[PDB]
Enzyme design. Structure first.
Site, short mmCIF file in Angstrom:
data_model
loop_
_atom_site.label_atom_id
_atom_site.label_comp_id
_atom_site.label_asym_id
_atom_site.label_seq_id
_atom_site.Cartn_x
_atom_site.Cartn_y
_atom_site.Cartn_z
N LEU A 1 3.87 -5.55 23.87
CA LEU A 1 4.87 -4.50 24.00
C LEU A 1 4.36 -3.33 24.84
O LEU A 1 5.15 -2.70 25.55
CB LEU A 1 5.30 -3.98 22.63
CG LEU A 1 5.96 -5.01 21.71
CD1 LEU A 1 6.35 -4.37 20.39
CD2 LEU A 1 7.17 -5.64 22.39
N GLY A 2 3.08 -3.04 24.76
CA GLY A 2 2.52 -1.93 25.49
C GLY A 2 1.11 -1.64 25.00
O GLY A 2 0.50 -2.46 24.30
N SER A 3 0.63 -0.47 25.36
CA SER A 3 -0.71 -0.04 24.99
C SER A 3 -0.63 1.36 24.41
O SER A 3 0.12 2.20 24.92
CB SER A 3 -1.65 -0.08 26.20
OG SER A 3 -1.58 1.12 26.95
N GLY A 4 -1.42 1.63 23.38
CA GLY A 4 -1.32 2.92 22.71
C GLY A 4 -2.66 3.50 22.32
O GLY A 4 -3.51 3.69 23.19
N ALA A 5 -2.87 3.81 21.04
CA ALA A 5 -4.10 4.44 20.59
C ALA A 5 -5.01 3.40 19.96
O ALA A 5 -4.61 2.69 19.02
CB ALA A 5 -3.82 5.57 19.60
N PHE A 6 -6.24 3.30 20.47
CA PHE A 6 -7.31 2.45 19.97
C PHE A 6 -7.07 0.97 20.24
O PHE A 6 -7.87 0.15 19.79
CB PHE A 6 -7.57 2.63 18.46
CG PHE A 6 -8.13 3.98 18.09
CD1 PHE A 6 -9.48 4.26 18.26
CD2 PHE A 6 -7.31 4.96 17.54
CE1 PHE A 6 -9.99 5.50 17.91
CE2 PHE A 6 -7.82 6.19 17.19
CZ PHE A 6 -9.17 6.46 17.37
N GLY A 7 -6.02 0.60 20.96
CA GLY A 7 -5.79 -0.80 21.26
C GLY A 7 -4.39 -1.06 21.78
O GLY A 7 -3.63 -0.13 22.08
N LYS B 1 -1.10 -4.12 16.22
CA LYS B 1 -2.00 -3.36 17.08
C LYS B 1 -3.39 -3.95 16.95
O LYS B 1 -4.00 -3.87 15.88
CB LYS B 1 -2.00 -1.88 16.72
CG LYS B 1 -2.94 -1.03 17.57
CD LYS B 1 -3.04 0.40 17.06
CE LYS B 1 -2.04 1.33 17.72
NZ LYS B 1 -2.34 2.76 17.39
N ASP C 1 -0.84 14.11 18.19
CA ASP C 1 -0.36 13.42 19.37
C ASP C 1 1.14 13.18 19.27
O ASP C 1 1.63 12.08 19.55
CB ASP C 1 -1.10 12.09 19.59
CG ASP C 1 -0.82 11.48 20.96
OD1 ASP C 1 -0.34 12.20 21.86
OD2 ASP C 1 -1.07 10.26 21.12
N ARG D 1 6.98 9.29 23.24
CA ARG D 1 6.52 7.91 23.18
C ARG D 1 6.15 7.49 21.76
O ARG D 1 6.18 6.30 21.44
CB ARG D 1 5.32 7.71 24.11
CG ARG D 1 4.09 8.51 23.69
CD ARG D 1 2.91 8.29 24.64
NE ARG D 1 1.78 9.14 24.26
CZ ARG D 1 1.50 10.30 24.82
NH1 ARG D 1 2.20 10.76 25.85
NH2 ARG D 1 0.49 11.03 24.35
N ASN D 2 5.78 8.45 20.91
CA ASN D 2 5.40 8.17 19.53
C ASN D 2 6.55 8.40 18.55
O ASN D 2 6.32 8.50 17.34
CB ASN D 2 4.18 8.99 19.14
CG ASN D 2 2.89 8.41 19.70
OD1 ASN D 2 2.78 7.20 19.93
ND2 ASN D 2 1.90 9.27 19.94
N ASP E 1 1.96 6.78 14.61
CA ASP E 1 0.62 7.02 15.17
C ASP E 1 0.17 8.47 15.02
O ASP E 1 -0.28 9.11 15.98
CB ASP E 1 0.56 6.58 16.64
CG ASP E 1 0.35 5.09 16.79
OD1 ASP E 1 1.10 4.31 16.16
OD2 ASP E 1 -0.58 4.70 17.53
#
Ligand code: YW5
Ligand code: Q6K
Length: 294
Positions: free
Chosen positions: A18-24, A45, A137, A141-142, A155
């Site tokens: 789906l995409g890329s986010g925090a820590f992975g 994730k 954060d 997007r979050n 997140d």
């Protein structure tokens, strides 16, 4: 410890990125209950790095907190798989994040959705403040879209210079009042239908522009009443910024009458879902006990 379920590698599968986010990286996945024949869509994730048993203690300690939130506008962590590279599991939101949603229905959303989104994000943030949890954060997007009428923050509690309060840029101070600053930028993201804040300006100069006193500009669909709340979220003194509980009331007041605070072309040709449609969405997609939209 009964809110975070320990998962095995064999009972779920990642199927699409789906995409890329925090820590992975975040995947759309499928959960297959042991001894069953059903496939349940989930979000997964996978961390971008390998871990050790010791670090997994810091992970599980935070994962228990992340699984302990209970609010209709805050996402809850559901499970974890301690497989060398740790995998986390939460509910999959089929409508995506609010950032992508608002870009895709650009100039075609309507004032009543936008204002209720601001109410719901503030409800979630005010919940995190009551739990004494700083997001650090908050951004469009979050904010995930469960239904177009129901958004949830994800997140929290884990550099986005262009969303951060000045005291976070200068001294890495993250409080609930700095979360209010990021909330102001998030609302700015929604009112500009997903524009990138301070686009084209190098991150290294952002602190200078804030110290000089300049802020993000007033969106054309925003009356001065809306822009002022945004500007009050970006005051240099953290304690002068509004509280999330005040933001709930203010945006609810503006939601009791949306067309006077947002000026959108075609706004009446849009409008929120009728009760018939609202009950249909909820029986299929959203069975939670959320309060209600204004
Ligand atoms: C030395 N070493 C440094 C770092 C290391 C470490 C690594 C990771 C986590 C950690 C621990 C726990 C979470 C996250 C991240 C993280 O990013 N989380 C998100 C989150 C947060 C809050 C609510 C919520 F619903 C979700 C989230 N997004 C997802 C997307 C798809 C599937 C599952 C998802 N889970 C929860 C903590 C410490 C340990 C010590
Ligand atoms: C804003 C990027 C985005 O979220 N895109 C999509 C998300 C979907 N669902 C979903 N459900 C739970 C968790 C997440 C999630 C959490 N974090 C931290 C993410 C980072 C990056 C990407 C996703 C993340 N996401 C989703 O459901 C199918 C679709 C999308 N996309 C690709 C676009 C939305 N729209 C075209 C359907």
């Amino acid at each position: 410890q009964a809110l975070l379920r320990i998962l095995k590698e064999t009972e779920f599968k990642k199927i699409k990125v789906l995409g890329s986010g925090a820590f992975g990286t975040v995947y759309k996945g499928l959960w297959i209950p042991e001894g069953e024949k059903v496939k349940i869509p989930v979000a997964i994730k996978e961390l971008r790095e390998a871990t050790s048993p010791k670090a997994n203690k810091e992970i599980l300690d935070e994962a228990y907190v992340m699984a302990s939130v209970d609010n209709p506008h805050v996402c809850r962590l559901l499970g974890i798989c301690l497989t060398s590279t740790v995998q986390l599991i939460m509910q999959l939101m089929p409508f995506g994040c609010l950032l992508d949603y608002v870009r895709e229905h650009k100039d075609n959303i309507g004032s009543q959705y936008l204002l209720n989104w601001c109410v719901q994000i503030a409800k979630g943030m005010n919940y995190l403040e009551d739990r004494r949890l700083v997001h650090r954060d908050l951004a469009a997007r979050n904010v995930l879209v469960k239904t177009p009428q129901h958004v949830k923050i994800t997140d929290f509690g884990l550099v986005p210079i262009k969303w951060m309060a000045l005291e976070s840029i200068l001294h890495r101070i993250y409080t609930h009042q700095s979360d209010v600053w990021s909330y102001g930028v998030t609302v700015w993201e929604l009112m500009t239908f997903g524009s990138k804040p301070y686009d084209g300006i190098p991150a290294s100069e952002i602190s200078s522009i804030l110290e000089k006193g300049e802020r993000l500009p007033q969106p054309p669909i925003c009356t001065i009443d809306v822009y002022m709340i945004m500007r009050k979220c970006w005051m240099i003194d953290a304690d002068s910024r509004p509280k999330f509980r005040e933001l709930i009331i203010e945006f609810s007041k503006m939601a009791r009458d949306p067309q006077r605070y947002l000026v959108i072309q075609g706004d009446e040709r849009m409008h929120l879902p009728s009760p018939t449609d609202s009950n249909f969405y909820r029986a299929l997609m959203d069975e939670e006990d959320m309060d209600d939209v204004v």
